[PDB]
Design a protein around this ligand. Structure first.
Ligand SMILES: COc1cc(/C(C)=N/NC(N)=S)ccc1O
Ligand SMILES: [Cl-]
Ligand SMILES: [Cl-]
Ligand SMILES: [Cl-]
Ligand SMILES: [Zn+2]
Length: 315
């Protein structure tokens, strides 16, 4: 007896493609690698319960290639498989609402993702790939599994792998519209004089070397090519936020002087992130866990600040 069912294939879970599959052959033999809501069904034969369901496949013809690029803005051949592999895990995570924000209950070393997600909900940022637009909208509403699996895929991290918050934000910023953001800096060495620089996009909102926005405005010491120490300060800033980052160090966070921050305890091979947010008071969100305090001191590694337009008074 020849038996078939109708299923749909997809690469973006919006555009569907009608298929008839032989129930005597695996999905793999018929589609190549195939996934059902993140589960790898390549080696599985069609079941009656599969009729009418949507399966993800890899882009193996020009129509799927165009749909996949339009939705994800990547042509990395292994992207969809990495996204499905992650999703199969993230759909099992819990996403509690903590002080009004979608968080993530700790699992699989996902603390860096929780503090990244919590941060995104506090800064003005629009993503460019539809995949991120759609999944972030769902994440804000509490259903963050697809958004987390996409972050993992875009950052080329697997579930359980140790992640860095600054690197993760850089990847997400790369897929955001930051074209309006601009930064002017001035570098002063006593032997070589001055040199001003202009930064755009992601580079205009990220800085590595100091956590304090005020000190960035007043000046920071860096090496110069002659062996002297030069000073660098912020001349002009046009952006809706800024992100200041540094190797983890004991740092004091004062209520009302920043938006949110990341705290890292541990070492370079393993550790743990927490998120600090400045609301009526300082709240520390550690996945599902919430505590409060009037003042905060701890090993901070990233601080986010609101911004619209800043121009220095320094001459
Ligand atoms: C085979 O797997 C993938 C293919 C692509 C697309 C759209 N490539 N298309 C061109 N290179 S023209 C994107 C992600 C994948 O996972
Ligand atoms: Cl898991
Ligand atoms: Cl968005
Ligand atoms: Cl403290
Ligand atoms: Zn010099």
């Amino acid at each position: 007896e020849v038996r078939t069912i109708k299923v749909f294939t997809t690469v973006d879970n919006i555009n569907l493609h009608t298929q008839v599959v032989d129930m005597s052959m695996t999905y793999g033999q018929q589609f190549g690698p195939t996934y059902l809501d993140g589960a790898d069904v390549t080696k599985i034969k069609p079941h009656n319960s599969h009729e009418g369901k949507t399966f993800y496949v890899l882009p193996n013809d020009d129509t799927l290639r165009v749909e996949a690029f339009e939705y994800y803005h990547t042509t990395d051949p292994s992207f969809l498989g990495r996204y499905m592999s992650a999703l199969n895990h993230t759909k099992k995570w819990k996403y509690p609402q903590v002080n009004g924000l979608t968080s993530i209950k700790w699992a699989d070393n996902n603390c860096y993702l929780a503090t990244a997600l919590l941060t995104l909900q506090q800064i003005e940022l629009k993503f460019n790939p539809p995949a991120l637009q759609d999944a972030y909208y769902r994440a804000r509403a509490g259903e963050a599994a697809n958004f987390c699996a996409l972050i993992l895929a875009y950052c080329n991290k697997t579930v359980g792998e140790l992640g860095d918050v600054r690197e993760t934000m850089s990847y997400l910023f790369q897929h955001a519209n930051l074209d309006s953001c601009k930064r002017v800096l001035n570098v002063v060495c006593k032997t070589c004089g001055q040199q001003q620089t202009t930064l755009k996009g992601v580079e205009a909102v990220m800085y590595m070397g100091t956590l304090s926005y005020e000190q960035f405005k007043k000046g920071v010491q860096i090496p110069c090519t002659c062996g002297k120490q030069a000073t660098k300060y912020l001349v002009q800033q046009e952006s809706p936020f800024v992100m200041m980052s540094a190797p983890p160090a004991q740092y004091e966070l004062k209520h009302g002087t920043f938006t949110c921050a990341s705290e890292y305890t541990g070492n370079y091979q393993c550790g743990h992130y927490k998120h600090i947010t400045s609301k009526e008071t300082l709240y520390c969100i550690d996945g599902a866990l919430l505590t409060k305090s009037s003042e905060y001191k701890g090993p901070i590694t990233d601080v986010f600040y609101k911004e619209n337009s800043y121009t220095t008074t320094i001459k």
